[PDB]
Design a protein around this ligand. Structure first.
Ligand SMILES: Cc1ccccc1CC(C)(C)NC[C@H](O)c1ccc(O)c2c1OCC(=O)N2
Ligand SMILES: CCCCCC/C=C\CCCCCC(=O)OC[C@@H](O)CO
Ligand code: NA
Lengths: 120, 454
């Protein structure tokens, strides 16, 4: 029963920069993975950038060097920096949280979704 | 009589409950050497005096250990000598004749225990039994030295004198019946619960995760438990004997230790798996492949086989004492005897090393959750409660057995056989609990419903 507020998306020119932002409202376990997924037009949902509660990160092989993920102090907010945007980065970006409350498995919380359109 | 239904009332099943069957020499409540079904060997404090009297009675060199067959023949002789002792005596025979079938057994019981001469010393209580004053004799007998030494046995015998029925012994068989159905429910739960888990993972392409690859192994180990180990063990206990010869006795025993090892070691592997899955998820995903995991599983089963089928089939696990020698020879005996070496080595592998790793790893999780990038709120309490169930259920079910297993190795006779078996069975039911612990994921939950179309 927690919420994920997404913000930052919109229209952007090719090669432009954009900053997605997601804040986690509620009580999430101290160990978790907060990140972003995307759905390209007519393609499957793909991991973009993720960040473990312990600081370490992970990116798709198509956004490495261009996209960078970071997080806030204790507000549990995650900022996604997207530089050098390409037309193939045009998709729907969902904010995601993997909560390890159960240890054995993981509980997913999703965001509402924010559109990002890159002017080809 | 036309009676072949269970619990016919007589002296034989009555004494078997009061005395019990013990093949190796033991000490009674007084300290005298007794063997079989309450057979007094001698009153000499020397164990060699006991053995010499025993060898004379049986007719061979027994080394303190007789067979079931020999024990029963001693039983009937001791019963017949009690009946002959009653009819020879002048105080016992008048009372014995004037008693009913049920109250005759209660008298024989007393004579069987403290001898013809001793029982005839109960002048007043025999005078009351003769005049059919059961409740006075009941009160009176409870004031004797016999009531203070073995009160539990006396109460039953006194009650048999008072009521004149088998009330004090009738209930003993009801509990065996209640025991049997519970075992069935255990087998049912273990089989149904685990067949479900394995089907859910095999059928759904989405429960095909690394962690679930370890669950499958844990579920497989628990499956063979409820199919092979648990039922055959139930029949062994219920029917009092073993009816599958020596080969299947050690084959079954091998399956027992094999699955218990593979189960607990997997619980250990899962704990480590979840540690890396949680503490360092990016390294965990890239390093631990499905092939690497399927190698881990193979090794856990290989170690399991090394501590089960290998030592057992090669008879390395075997004890050397006479009671173990006889049981290994007897086709209808499948009692479990091992040497210090095996019982210690198997316990460390099957339980103790997994235990330590799991306690360590699950601590590192709780301790590292404190030191992350972060109010004393709700989500942590519910999480702490989870591992309290995870680690608690494992501990509560297997720790009491493996402790006792060790204590029986250090000091002999410290653990009664009944306890060792009950605690072993409390460990068996952990195979039923596991599918309720390791399969609460939303994916398992959805799979479980679709599988049985709820
Ligand atoms: C056959 C019989 C007769 C009477 C009562 C019980 C049984 C069944 C038995 C004892 C075989 N259960 C095996 C038990 O679950 C077990 C499991 C893993 C182990 O590593 C060990 C172990 O036994 C002690 C040990 O040192 N190692
Ligand atoms: C859980 C339920 C399993 C109980 C298994 C216990 C076996 C045992 O104690 O047998 C002793 C008797 O035969 C004599 O009273
Ligand atoms: Na045997």
């Amino acid at each position: 029963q927690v919420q994920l507020q997404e913000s930052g998306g919109g229209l952007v020119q090719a090669g432009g920069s954009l900053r997605l932002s997601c804040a986690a409202s509620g009580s999430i376990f101290a160990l978790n993975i907060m990140g972003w997924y995307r759905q390209a037009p007519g393609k499957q949902r793909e991991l973009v950038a993720a960040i473990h509660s312990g600081g370490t990160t992970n990116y798709a092989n198509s956004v490495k060097g261009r996209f960078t993920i970071s997080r806030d102090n204790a507000a549990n907010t995650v900022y996604l920096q997207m530089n050098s945007l390409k037309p193939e980065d045009t998709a729907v970006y969902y904010c995601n949280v993997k909560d390890f409350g159960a240890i054995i498995y993981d509980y997913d919380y999703w965001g509402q979704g924010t559109q990002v359109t890159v002017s080809s | 009589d036309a009676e072949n239904l269970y619990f016919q009332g007589n002296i034989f099943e009555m004494l078997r409950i009061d005395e019990g069957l013990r093949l190796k020499i033991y000490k009674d409540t007084e300290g005298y050497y007794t063997i079989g079904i309450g057979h007094l060997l001698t009153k000499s404090p020397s164990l060699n005096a006991a053995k010499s009297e025993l060898d004379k009675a049986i007719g061979r060199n027994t080394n303190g250990v007789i067979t079931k067959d020999e024990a029963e023949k001693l039983f009937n002789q001791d019963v017949d000598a009690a009946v002959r002792g009653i009819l020879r005596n002048a105080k016992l025979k008048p009372v014995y004749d004037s008693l009913d079938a049920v109250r005759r057994a209660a008298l024989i019981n007393m004579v069987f225990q403290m001898g013809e001469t001793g029982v005839a010393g109960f002048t007043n209580s025999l005078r009351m039994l003769q005049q059919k004053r059961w409740d006075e004799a009941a009160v009176n007998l409870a004031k004797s030295r016999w009531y203070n030494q073995t009160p539990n046995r006396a109460k039953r015998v006194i009650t048999t004198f008072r009521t004149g029925t088998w009330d004090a012994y009738a209930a003993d068989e009801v509990w065996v019946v209640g025991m049997g159905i519970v075992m069935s429910l255990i087998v049912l739960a273990i089989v149904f619960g685990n067949v479900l888990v394995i089907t859910a993972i095999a059928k759904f392409e989405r429960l095909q995760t690394v962690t679930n690859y370890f669950i499958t192994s844990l579920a497989c180990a628990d499956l063979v438990m409820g199919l092979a180990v648990v039922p055959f063990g139930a029949a062994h206990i219920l029917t009092k004997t073993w009816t599958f010869g020596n080969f299947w006795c050690e084959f079954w025993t091998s399956i027992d230790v094999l699955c218990v090892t593979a189960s607990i070691e997997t619980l250990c592997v899962i704990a480590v798996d979840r540690y890396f899955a949680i503490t360092s998820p990016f390294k965990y995903q890239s390093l631990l492949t499905k092939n690497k995991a399927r190698v881990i599983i193979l090794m856990v089963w290989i170690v399991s086989g090394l501590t089960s089928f290998l030592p057992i089939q090669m008879h390395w696990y075997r004890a050397t004492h006479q009671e173990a020698i006889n049981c290994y020879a007897e086709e209808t005996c499948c009692d479990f005897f091992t040497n210090q070496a095996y019982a210690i080595a198997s316990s460390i592998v099957s339980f103790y090393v997994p235990l330590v790793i799991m306690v360590f790893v699950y601590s590192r999780v709780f301790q590292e959750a404190k030191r992350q990038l972060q109010k004393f709120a709700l989500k942590e309490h519910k999480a702490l409660k989870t591992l309290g169930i995870i680690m608690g259920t494992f501990t509560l079910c297997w720790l009491p057995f493996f402790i006792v297993n060790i204590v029986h190795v250090i000091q002999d006779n410290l653990i009664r056989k009944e306890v060792y078996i009950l605690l072993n069975w409390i460990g068996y039911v952990n195979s039923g609990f596991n599918p309720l612990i390791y399969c609460r994921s939303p994916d398992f939950r959805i799979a479980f419903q679709e599988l049985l179309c709820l």
